[PDB]
């Protein structure tokens, strides 16, 4: 019919945070929920869709594609264990990878769609949502607030959960460049590619492209500062740089693209600020992600933005307008799917259950699917050392024995535990090597239970594994004392 | 002749830890006896123990090696193309690379002895001459020539364990794990006998390296392999072994073995069935190695099954005589023997009594795919707690829908005391499981409840996060009885 529909909760953006909120409110609490997204399945023109950034063009397809990339290491490393086969026959078929990923993703899209069609009180609306007033969300045909109205949805409570978007720098020839969004759909793997950025996406893609490159290919990563993966453990930052270099990736630090132009053959010609040049078939920018707040017409209700650009929120995800909340990357804090999900669950417990609950943003475990991957939870030592008078660092680094037979001698596993040495409390744990993302998960539970180094040391090791290293350290390699590093007290 | 604070019989997992800790932490004078300096025939274990020479260390390399049979197949799902007809598994290369790694550790360990004050290695066979004297002889025979008499304040028994070989006719045409480590050729047809981890691990090893037309059979006298591990996991690992071409013969037991004219083995089971294979590997058990020690010289008591009786501080019935590791016939794991060794040394030579905790010890089976476990299985929990909840997740991860190994179900189970949420055990089957489970070991040392798991933020995408996404039991045990709803 031609009438608006009414809800307890309207959620704009059917992604990690919004889906957790909406499912919880409808199924745990009997609320009537509407959820809006721009697309029912992944890909061009809008990339993200039902299921969010993670399902469509994020965690899920990238993990698949890293898993694909790892077979290059596997097929080579097999020879050290006796495997023999015609090495000259090996090809990496990118198009098969992409078609397999696309169908996996589309199956989640269809699955999610089916759940909306079926679940009472939980409704999907296709289009672009924005705030018309504090109790009405309008759903339009495009992100232009002048496009046609498909629905008006009344809402007692409104959740903003539109996520983030790739930031593109304002350089000449930026139009010749792509983001991670387009990278997922490249018709063919680039012979030569530049990945611009030192963060997890650049690095992860650098390893994907490096395994699927055609014959005379070359992957280059550039970063404007001097060491990639700011925010992660420094030892690990240096080591993953070496290991990426060891597998044929050229890391360019202290380099930033100044312009891009097309060569007469149509390749991209990149000029760096230093006047170095590089010719490539693809330039993928991954220099950052920014909150998606522009299309919500927040000025219509006066929802405040932080100096930085995220929707401002309190610890309860509340904006300055009482019944309007924000969760996920739109708050511009930790841009991780399970953080968005925890925030959603906790919002809905607080507002609709009788159960106030704030997300804990500390001691969050995360991973980088570099090759080999990082697993990390809690504080890096230089941050810990500014908060706590005495810090101890327990460190074990070693090429594991499998990799002395596989040939990949450069694959050094690193395990570090950072403590408040005043009481043993584990402040952070940082891992580099095969299995690190899997090892770190239950370490997150330890940290939430305020584990001490002796709790780890007293646990009996599972042997032989990499993880047992965390249960074998009782003497600090070094310390920080009122901020200064020294091998002894 | 010669005087020591500590004489350790067996340079193995427990014995080395104890010997190291006594010499370097307490500045004691230590002698350590073992029968061989380097791995391999004739005594198999050597300096380093069973783990280093014919156990954890080389078995893991070999299972790593076997995993490629899967990785090579599964690469195709992700686009990888190559001539599969060209693929062959070179067992001899694997064996050589393994031998080299093990040999390096043997040498390294020798270097360590050579450079460590108060830590001496003696080659030979040790036994108890009297309450304070360890005789070191030429051979296992207690009548063979004396090489040494070591006087000792304190004597450590740490000679480990040995494969149990049943007394069936033709048992001498069978091998054990010791021999499996050195086979010249990968066996084309093989029978592994036994339901425990060593049988299962070797079954997956031989399965990957068998020549064309090959075939691994695993047999087990009872109805389901891997007793002691979680039941769902036992059933699922059986399915996953069968999917990868291993034939699992349950309720079958060899009654005899004969030699065929081609040098193969003819097996007859108790049921009358028969099977011809090239190698029959008996892995039905491992028994405490107490026989050459001459414990009767001083009257150290054995328990009924044959381990050296110990108290919780590793003390035998005779003052200043201790036993740790497999010889005590408890948990036969390397980190458990190390921990015993350490705790014993701190008690005897240090200011503080310390006893090893044998509960909530994390462990793995390097089956393909592998198991990780820590703490109680639900049937054991249900005889000791009135109200037990089980939380279970089981699904083929997406990566294995693409790889084409659709049979590879990941299983995560968490078993709780439902009266207060205390996690009593966690049980995993799937790639990464032994890695996942280590930090769960630490969790169980922190009174972790199911809600502590559940309120922790996942790392995505991993198999592990599955342990932080369960808050609703799948079923219960109330007063020992399995049901799906609580009263
Ligand atoms: C390449 C890449 C790899 C990643 N890998 C990981 C990883 O491995 N692990 C991890 O934890 N995190 C990963 N992330 C980050 C993760 O994807 C995000 O943190 C998470 O998806 C954010 O959840 P959200 O609810 O804020 O938004 P999203 O999941 O991004 O959902 C926002 C939704 O809003 C829709 N939308 C936008 N504007 C409107 C509008 N006006 N109207 C209606 N709908 C709208 C979008 O179409 C989208 O579906 C990755 C991200 C990227 C880009
Ligand atoms: C095939 C196999 C795989 C295994 N895999 C694992 C695994 O993955 N993880 C794990 O945790 N555990 C594993 N184990 C178990 C592990 O090897 C044992 O629990 C561990 O080695 C026990 O150490 P120990 O100190 O009791 O004795 P051991 O390490 O066996 O050492 C005892 C030593 O005493 C010597 N010795 C014996 N008699 C005499 C004598 N009278 N005089 C002088 N020396 C003597 C022996 O040569 C031997 O080196 C495995 C065992 C086997 C057989
Ligand atoms: C809880 C939940 N959180 C999400 C968080 C982020 C994303 Cl991207 C997706 C979900 C997912 C979801 C999918 C579709 C609509 C809402 C929520 N989702 C629902 C998943 N759901 C699990 C339980 N389920 C049941 O039917 C059920 C409920 C109770 C016992 O079984 C079907 C699928
Ligand atoms: C402690 C220890 N326990 C063992 C338990 C079981 C085995 Cl099978 C081997 C060891 C090993 C050892 C090897 C040789 C003789 C005695 C002990 N050993 C010493 C090996 N050690 C590794 C680390 N190391 C250190 O000095 C050290 C300790 C803490 C930080 O660095 C040098 C040698
Ligand atoms: Cl291709
Ligand atoms: Cl940059
Ligand atoms: Cl820097
Ligand atoms: Cl061979
Ligand atoms: Cl049996
Ligand atoms: Cl049984
Ligand atoms: Na509905
Ligand atoms: Na330990
Ligand atoms: Na010495
Ligand atoms: Na959780």
CSV table of N, CA and C in Angstrom, one decimal, chain B residues 125-257:
chain,number,residue,atom,x,y,z
B,125,UNK,N,73.6,-48.8,30.7
B,125,UNK,CA,72.3,-49.2,31.2
B,125,UNK,C,72.3,-49.1,32.8
B,126,UNK,N,71.5,-48.2,33.3
B,126,UNK,CA,71.5,-48.1,34.8
B,126,UNK,C,70.5,-48.9,35.5
B,127,UNK,N,70.9,-49.4,36.7
B,127,UNK,CA,70.1,-50.0,37.6
B,127,UNK,C,70.5,-49.8,39.1
B,128,UNK,N,69.6,-50.1,40.0
B,128,UNK,CA,69.8,-49.9,41.4
B,128,UNK,C,70.5,-51.1,42.0
B,129,UNK,N,71.8,-50.9,42.3
B,129,UNK,CA,72.6,-51.8,43.1
B,129,UNK,C,72.2,-51.7,44.6
B,130,UNK,N,72.0,-50.6,45.2
B,130,UNK,CA,71.6,-50.4,46.6
B,130,UNK,C,70.9,-49.1,46.7
B,131,UNK,N,70.4,-48.8,47.9
B,131,UNK,CA,69.6,-47.5,48.1
B,131,UNK,C,70.3,-46.2,47.7
B,132,UNK,N,71.7,-46.3,47.6
B,132,UNK,CA,72.4,-45.1,47.2
B,132,UNK,C,73.4,-45.3,46.2
B,133,UNK,N,73.3,-46.4,45.4
B,133,UNK,CA,74.3,-46.7,44.4
B,133,UNK,C,73.6,-47.1,43.1
B,134,UNK,N,73.9,-46.4,42.0
B,134,UNK,CA,73.4,-46.7,40.6
B,134,UNK,C,74.5,-47.4,39.8
B,135,UNK,N,74.3,-48.6,39.4
B,135,UNK,CA,75.3,-49.3,38.6
B,135,UNK,C,74.9,-49.0,37.2
B,136,UNK,N,75.9,-48.7,36.4
B,136,UNK,CA,75.8,-48.5,35.0
B,136,UNK,C,76.5,-49.6,34.3
B,137,UNK,N,75.8,-50.5,33.6
B,137,UNK,CA,76.4,-51.7,32.9
B,137,UNK,C,76.5,-51.6,31.4
B,138,UNK,N,77.0,-52.6,30.8
B,138,UNK,CA,77.1,-52.7,29.3
B,138,UNK,C,75.8,-52.9,28.6
B,139,UNK,N,74.9,-53.7,29.1
B,139,UNK,CA,73.8,-54.0,28.4
B,139,UNK,C,72.6,-54.1,29.4
B,140,UNK,N,71.4,-54.3,28.8
B,140,UNK,CA,70.2,-54.5,29.6
B,140,UNK,C,70.4,-55.7,30.6
B,141,UNK,N,71.4,-56.6,30.2
B,141,UNK,CA,71.6,-57.8,31.1
B,141,UNK,C,72.3,-57.4,32.4
B,142,UNK,N,71.7,-57.6,33.5
B,142,UNK,CA,72.2,-57.1,34.8
B,142,UNK,C,73.5,-57.9,35.2
B,143,UNK,N,73.9,-58.9,34.4
B,143,UNK,CA,75.1,-59.7,34.5
B,143,UNK,C,76.2,-59.2,33.6
B,144,UNK,N,75.9,-58.3,32.6
B,144,UNK,CA,76.9,-57.7,31.7
B,144,UNK,C,77.9,-56.9,32.5
B,145,UNK,N,79.0,-56.6,31.9
B,145,UNK,CA,80.1,-55.8,32.6
B,145,UNK,C,79.8,-54.4,33.1
B,146,UNK,N,80.2,-54.1,34.3
B,146,UNK,CA,80.2,-52.7,35.0
B,146,UNK,C,81.1,-51.7,34.3
B,147,UNK,N,80.4,-50.6,33.8
B,147,UNK,CA,81.1,-49.4,33.4
B,147,UNK,C,81.3,-48.3,34.5
B,148,UNK,N,80.3,-48.3,35.4
B,148,UNK,CA,80.3,-47.2,36.5
B,148,UNK,C,79.6,-47.6,37.7
B,149,UNK,N,80.0,-47.1,38.8
B,149,UNK,CA,79.3,-47.0,40.1
B,149,UNK,C,79.2,-45.6,40.5
B,150,UNK,N,77.9,-45.1,40.6
B,150,UNK,CA,77.7,-43.7,40.9
B,150,UNK,C,77.0,-43.8,42.2
B,151,UNK,N,77.6,-43.2,43.2
B,151,UNK,CA,77.0,-43.0,44.5
B,151,UNK,C,76.1,-41.8,44.4
B,152,UNK,N,75.0,-41.8,45.1
B,152,UNK,CA,74.0,-40.8,44.9
B,152,UNK,C,73.3,-40.5,46.2
B,153,UNK,N,73.1,-39.3,46.5
B,153,UNK,CA,72.3,-38.9,47.6
B,153,UNK,C,70.8,-39.2,47.3
B,154,UNK,N,70.5,-38.9,46.0
B,154,UNK,CA,69.1,-38.9,45.5
B,154,UNK,C,69.1,-39.6,44.1
B,155,UNK,N,68.1,-40.5,43.9
B,155,UNK,CA,68.1,-41.2,42.7
B,155,UNK,C,66.8,-41.0,41.9
B,156,UNK,N,66.9,-40.6,40.6
B,156,UNK,CA,65.7,-40.3,39.8
B,156,UNK,C,65.4,-41.4,38.8
B,157,UNK,N,64.3,-42.1,38.9
B,157,UNK,CA,63.9,-43.0,37.9
B,157,UNK,C,63.1,-42.4,36.7
B,158,UNK,N,63.7,-42.3,35.5
B,158,UNK,CA,63.0,-41.6,34.4
B,158,UNK,C,63.2,-42.3,33.1
B,159,UNK,N,63.1,-43.6,33.0
B,159,UNK,CA,63.4,-44.4,31.9
B,159,UNK,C,62.2,-44.5,30.9
B,160,UNK,N,61.1,-43.9,31.2
B,160,UNK,CA,60.0,-43.8,30.3
B,160,UNK,C,59.2,-45.0,30.0
B,161,UNK,N,58.8,-45.3,28.8
B,161,UNK,CA,57.9,-46.4,28.5
B,161,UNK,C,58.3,-47.1,27.2
B,162,UNK,N,57.5,-48.2,26.9
B,162,UNK,CA,57.9,-49.0,25.8
B,162,UNK,C,56.6,-49.5,25.1
B,163,UNK,N,56.7,-49.8,23.8
B,163,UNK,CA,55.5,-50.4,23.2
B,163,UNK,C,55.1,-51.8,23.7
B,164,UNK,N,53.8,-51.9,23.9
B,164,UNK,CA,53.2,-53.2,24.4
B,164,UNK,C,53.0,-54.0,23.2
B,165,UNK,N,53.5,-55.3,23.2
B,165,UNK,CA,53.3,-56.1,22.1
B,165,UNK,C,52.6,-57.4,22.6
B,166,UNK,N,51.3,-57.6,22.2
B,166,UNK,CA,50.5,-58.7,22.7
B,166,UNK,C,51.2,-60.1,22.3
B,167,UNK,N,50.9,-61.1,23.2
B,167,UNK,CA,51.6,-62.4,23.0
B,167,UNK,C,50.7,-63.3,22.1
B,168,UNK,N,50.7,-62.9,20.8
B,168,UNK,CA,49.9,-63.7,19.9
B,168,UNK,C,51.0,-64.4,19.0
B,169,UNK,N,50.7,-65.6,18.5
B,169,UNK,CA,51.7,-66.3,17.6
B,169,UNK,C,52.1,-65.3,16.4
B,170,UNK,N,53.4,-65.2,16.1
B,170,UNK,CA,53.8,-64.4,15.0
B,170,UNK,C,53.9,-62.9,15.3
B,171,UNK,N,53.8,-62.6,16.6
B,171,UNK,CA,54.0,-61.2,17.0
B,171,UNK,C,55.4,-60.6,16.6
B,172,UNK,N,56.4,-61.5,16.4
B,172,UNK,CA,57.7,-61.1,16.0
B,172,UNK,C,57.7,-60.6,14.5
B,173,UNK,N,56.7,-60.9,13.7
B,173,UNK,CA,56.6,-60.4,12.3
B,173,UNK,C,55.9,-59.0,12.3
B,174,UNK,N,55.6,-58.4,13.5
B,174,UNK,CA,55.0,-57.1,13.6
B,174,UNK,C,56.0,-56.1,14.0
B,175,UNK,N,55.7,-54.8,13.7
B,175,UNK,CA,56.6,-53.7,14.2
B,175,UNK,C,55.9,-52.8,15.2
B,176,UNK,N,56.6,-51.9,15.9
B,176,UNK,CA,56.0,-50.8,16.6
B,176,UNK,C,56.3,-49.4,16.0
B,177,UNK,N,55.8,-48.4,16.6
B,177,UNK,CA,56.2,-47.0,16.2
B,177,UNK,C,57.7,-46.9,16.1
B,178,UNK,N,58.5,-47.6,16.9
B,178,UNK,CA,60.0,-47.3,16.9
B,178,UNK,C,60.5,-47.6,15.5
B,179,UNK,N,60.1,-48.8,15.0
B,179,UNK,CA,60.5,-49.2,13.7
B,179,UNK,C,59.8,-48.4,12.6
B,180,UNK,N,58.7,-47.9,12.8
B,180,UNK,CA,57.9,-47.1,11.8
B,180,UNK,C,58.7,-45.9,11.3
B,181,UNK,N,59.4,-45.3,12.3
B,181,UNK,CA,60.3,-44.1,12.0
B,181,UNK,C,61.5,-44.4,11.0
B,182,UNK,N,61.7,-45.7,10.7
B,182,UNK,CA,62.9,-46.0,9.9
B,182,UNK,C,62.6,-46.9,8.7
B,183,UNK,N,61.4,-47.1,8.4
B,183,UNK,CA,61.1,-48.1,7.3
B,183,UNK,C,61.8,-47.6,6.0
B,184,UNK,N,62.4,-48.5,5.3
B,184,UNK,CA,63.1,-48.1,4.1
B,184,UNK,C,62.2,-47.6,3.0
B,185,UNK,N,61.0,-48.1,3.0
B,185,UNK,CA,60.1,-47.8,1.9
B,185,UNK,C,58.7,-47.5,2.5
B,186,UNK,N,57.9,-46.6,1.9
B,186,UNK,CA,56.6,-46.4,2.5
B,186,UNK,C,55.8,-47.7,2.2
B,187,UNK,N,55.2,-48.2,3.2
B,187,UNK,CA,54.4,-49.5,3.0
B,187,UNK,C,53.2,-49.3,2.1
B,188,UNK,N,53.0,-50.2,1.2
B,188,UNK,CA,51.9,-50.0,0.3
B,188,UNK,C,50.6,-50.4,1.0
B,189,UNK,N,50.6,-51.6,1.6
B,189,UNK,CA,49.4,-51.9,2.4
B,189,UNK,C,49.9,-52.0,3.9
B,190,UNK,N,49.1,-51.4,4.8
B,190,UNK,CA,49.6,-51.4,6.2
B,190,UNK,C,48.4,-51.5,7.1
B,191,UNK,N,48.6,-52.3,8.1
B,191,UNK,CA,47.7,-52.4,9.2
B,191,UNK,C,48.3,-51.7,10.5
B,192,UNK,N,47.7,-50.6,11.0
B,192,UNK,CA,48.0,-50.1,12.3
B,192,UNK,C,47.0,-50.7,13.3
B,193,UNK,N,47.5,-51.2,14.5
B,193,UNK,CA,46.7,-51.9,15.4
B,193,UNK,C,46.6,-51.1,16.7
B,194,UNK,N,45.4,-50.7,17.1
B,194,UNK,CA,45.2,-49.8,18.2
B,194,UNK,C,44.3,-48.6,17.9
B,195,UNK,N,43.6,-48.2,18.9
B,195,UNK,CA,42.7,-47.1,18.8
B,195,UNK,C,43.2,-45.7,19.3
B,196,UNK,N,44.4,-45.7,19.8
B,196,UNK,CA,44.9,-44.5,20.5
B,196,UNK,C,45.7,-43.6,19.5
B,197,UNK,N,46.3,-42.5,20.0
B,197,UNK,CA,46.7,-41.4,19.2
B,197,UNK,C,47.8,-41.9,18.2
B,198,UNK,N,48.7,-42.8,18.6
B,198,UNK,CA,49.9,-43.2,17.9
B,198,UNK,C,49.4,-44.0,16.7
B,199,UNK,N,48.5,-44.9,16.9
B,199,UNK,CA,47.9,-45.6,15.8
B,199,UNK,C,47.2,-44.7,14.7
B,200,UNK,N,46.4,-43.8,15.2
B,200,UNK,CA,45.7,-42.8,14.4
B,200,UNK,C,46.7,-41.9,13.6
B,201,UNK,N,47.7,-41.5,14.3
B,201,UNK,CA,48.6,-40.5,13.7
B,201,UNK,C,49.4,-41.1,12.6
B,202,UNK,N,49.8,-42.4,12.8
B,202,UNK,CA,50.6,-43.1,11.8
B,202,UNK,C,49.7,-43.6,10.7
B,203,UNK,N,48.5,-44.0,11.0
B,203,UNK,CA,47.5,-44.2,9.9
B,203,UNK,C,47.5,-43.0,8.9
B,204,UNK,N,47.3,-41.8,9.4
B,204,UNK,CA,47.3,-40.5,8.5
B,204,UNK,C,48.6,-40.3,7.8
B,205,UNK,N,49.7,-40.6,8.5
B,205,UNK,CA,51.1,-40.5,7.9
B,205,UNK,C,51.2,-41.5,6.7
B,206,UNK,N,51.0,-42.8,6.9
B,206,UNK,CA,51.1,-43.8,5.9
B,206,UNK,C,50.1,-43.6,4.7
B,207,UNK,N,48.9,-43.1,5.1
B,207,UNK,CA,47.9,-42.8,4.1
B,207,UNK,C,48.4,-41.8,3.0
B,208,UNK,N,49.2,-40.8,3.5
B,208,UNK,CA,49.6,-39.8,2.6
B,208,UNK,C,50.8,-40.2,1.7
B,209,UNK,N,51.7,-41.1,2.3
B,209,UNK,CA,52.9,-41.4,1.6
B,209,UNK,C,52.8,-42.8,0.9
B,210,UNK,N,51.7,-43.5,1.0
B,210,UNK,CA,51.6,-44.8,0.4
B,210,UNK,C,51.8,-44.7,-1.2
B,211,UNK,N,52.4,-45.8,-1.8
B,211,UNK,CA,52.6,-45.8,-3.3
B,211,UNK,C,51.2,-46.1,-3.9
B,212,UNK,N,51.1,-46.0,-5.3
B,212,UNK,CA,49.9,-46.2,-6.0
B,212,UNK,C,49.2,-47.6,-5.7
B,213,UNK,N,47.9,-47.6,-5.6
B,213,UNK,CA,47.2,-48.8,-5.3
B,213,UNK,C,47.3,-49.2,-3.8
B,214,UNK,N,48.0,-48.3,-3.0
B,214,UNK,CA,48.2,-48.6,-1.5
B,214,UNK,C,46.9,-48.5,-0.7
B,215,UNK,N,46.9,-48.7,0.6
B,215,UNK,CA,45.7,-48.8,1.4
B,215,UNK,C,46.1,-49.0,2.9
B,216,UNK,N,45.7,-48.1,3.8
B,216,UNK,CA,45.9,-48.2,5.2
B,216,UNK,C,44.7,-48.7,5.9
B,217,UNK,N,44.8,-49.7,6.7
B,217,UNK,CA,43.7,-50.2,7.6
B,217,UNK,C,44.1,-50.0,9.0
B,218,UNK,N,43.2,-49.4,9.8
B,218,UNK,CA,43.3,-49.3,11.2
B,218,UNK,C,42.4,-50.2,11.9
B,219,UNK,N,42.9,-51.0,12.9
B,219,UNK,CA,41.9,-51.8,13.6
B,219,UNK,C,41.9,-51.6,15.1
B,220,UNK,N,40.8,-51.9,15.7
B,220,UNK,CA,40.7,-51.5,17.1
B,220,UNK,C,39.8,-52.5,17.7
B,221,UNK,N,40.1,-53.1,18.8
B,221,UNK,CA,39.4,-54.2,19.4
B,221,UNK,C,38.0,-53.8,19.9
B,222,UNK,N,37.7,-52.5,20.3
B,222,UNK,CA,36.4,-52.1,20.8
B,222,UNK,C,35.7,-51.3,19.7
B,223,UNK,N,34.5,-50.7,20.0
B,223,UNK,CA,33.7,-50.3,18.9
B,223,UNK,C,33.9,-48.8,18.4
B,224,UNK,N,34.7,-48.0,19.1
B,224,UNK,CA,35.0,-46.7,18.7
B,224,UNK,C,36.4,-46.2,19.1
B,225,UNK,N,37.2,-45.8,18.1
B,225,UNK,CA,38.5,-45.4,18.4
B,225,UNK,C,38.7,-44.2,19.4
B,226,UNK,N,39.9,-44.0,19.9
B,226,UNK,CA,40.2,-42.8,20.8
B,226,UNK,C,39.5,-42.7,22.1
B,227,UNK,N,39.4,-43.8,22.9
B,227,UNK,CA,38.8,-43.8,24.2
B,227,UNK,C,39.5,-42.7,25.0
B,228,UNK,N,38.7,-42.0,25.9
B,228,UNK,CA,39.2,-41.0,26.7
B,228,UNK,C,39.0,-39.6,26.0
B,229,UNK,N,38.8,-39.5,24.7
B,229,UNK,CA,38.5,-38.2,24.1
B,229,UNK,C,37.1,-38.0,23.9
B,230,UNK,N,36.7,-36.8,23.6
B,230,UNK,CA,35.3,-36.5,23.5
B,230,UNK,C,34.6,-37.4,22.4
B,231,UNK,N,33.4,-37.8,22.8
B,231,UNK,CA,32.7,-38.8,21.9
B,231,UNK,C,32.3,-38.3,20.5
B,232,UNK,N,31.8,-37.1,20.4
B,232,UNK,CA,31.4,-36.5,19.1
B,232,UNK,C,32.7,-36.5,18.3
B,233,UNK,N,33.8,-36.1,18.9
B,233,UNK,CA,35.0,-36.0,18.2
B,233,UNK,C,35.5,-37.3,17.8
B,234,UNK,N,35.3,-38.4,18.7
B,234,UNK,CA,35.7,-39.7,18.3
B,234,UNK,C,35.0,-40.2,17.0
B,235,UNK,N,33.6,-39.9,17.0
B,235,UNK,CA,32.8,-40.3,15.9
B,235,UNK,C,33.3,-39.6,14.6
B,236,UNK,N,33.5,-38.3,14.8
B,236,UNK,CA,33.8,-37.4,13.6
B,236,UNK,C,35.2,-37.7,13.0
B,237,UNK,N,36.2,-37.8,13.9
B,237,UNK,CA,37.5,-38.2,13.4
B,237,UNK,C,37.4,-39.5,12.6
B,238,UNK,N,36.6,-40.5,13.1
B,238,UNK,CA,36.4,-41.7,12.4
B,238,UNK,C,35.9,-41.5,10.9
B,239,UNK,N,34.9,-40.6,10.8
B,239,UNK,CA,34.3,-40.3,9.5
B,239,UNK,C,35.3,-39.6,8.7
B,240,UNK,N,36.1,-38.7,9.2
B,240,UNK,CA,37.0,-37.9,8.5
B,240,UNK,C,38.3,-38.7,8.0
B,241,UNK,N,38.7,-39.6,8.9
B,241,UNK,CA,39.7,-40.7,8.4
B,241,UNK,C,39.2,-41.5,7.3
B,242,UNK,N,38.0,-42.0,7.4
B,242,UNK,CA,37.3,-42.8,6.3
B,242,UNK,C,37.2,-42.0,5.0
B,243,UNK,N,36.8,-40.7,5.1
B,243,UNK,CA,36.7,-39.9,3.9
B,243,UNK,C,38.0,-39.8,3.1
B,244,UNK,N,39.1,-39.8,3.9
B,244,UNK,CA,40.4,-39.6,3.2
B,244,UNK,C,41.1,-41.0,2.9
B,245,UNK,N,40.2,-42.0,2.8
B,245,UNK,CA,40.6,-43.3,2.3
B,245,UNK,C,41.2,-44.4,3.3
B,246,UNK,N,41.2,-44.1,4.6
B,246,UNK,CA,41.6,-45.0,5.6
B,246,UNK,C,40.4,-45.9,6.0
B,247,UNK,N,40.6,-47.2,6.0
B,247,UNK,CA,39.6,-48.2,6.4
B,247,UNK,C,39.7,-48.4,7.9
B,248,UNK,N,38.7,-48.1,8.7
B,248,UNK,CA,38.6,-48.3,10.1
B,248,UNK,C,37.9,-49.6,10.5
B,249,UNK,N,38.6,-50.6,10.9
B,249,UNK,CA,38.0,-51.9,11.4
B,249,UNK,C,37.8,-52.0,12.9
B,250,UNK,N,36.7,-51.6,13.4
B,250,UNK,CA,36.4,-51.7,14.8
B,250,UNK,C,35.9,-53.1,15.2
B,251,UNK,N,35.8,-53.4,16.5
B,251,UNK,CA,35.5,-54.7,17.0
B,251,UNK,C,36.3,-55.8,16.4
B,252,UNK,N,37.6,-55.5,16.0
B,252,UNK,CA,38.5,-56.5,15.4
B,252,UNK,C,39.8,-56.5,16.2
B,253,UNK,N,40.4,-57.7,16.3
B,253,UNK,CA,41.7,-57.9,17.0
B,253,UNK,C,42.5,-59.0,16.4
B,254,UNK,N,43.8,-58.8,16.1
B,254,UNK,CA,44.6,-59.8,15.5
B,254,UNK,C,44.8,-61.0,16.5
B,255,UNK,N,44.6,-62.2,16.0
B,255,UNK,CA,44.8,-63.5,16.8
B,255,UNK,C,46.1,-64.1,16.4
B,256,UNK,N,46.6,-63.9,15.1
B,256,UNK,CA,47.9,-64.4,14.7
B,256,UNK,C,48.3,-63.7,13.5
B,257,UNK,N,49.7,-63.7,13.3
B,257,UNK,CA,50.3,-63.2,12.0
B,257,UNK,C,51.3,-64.2,11.5
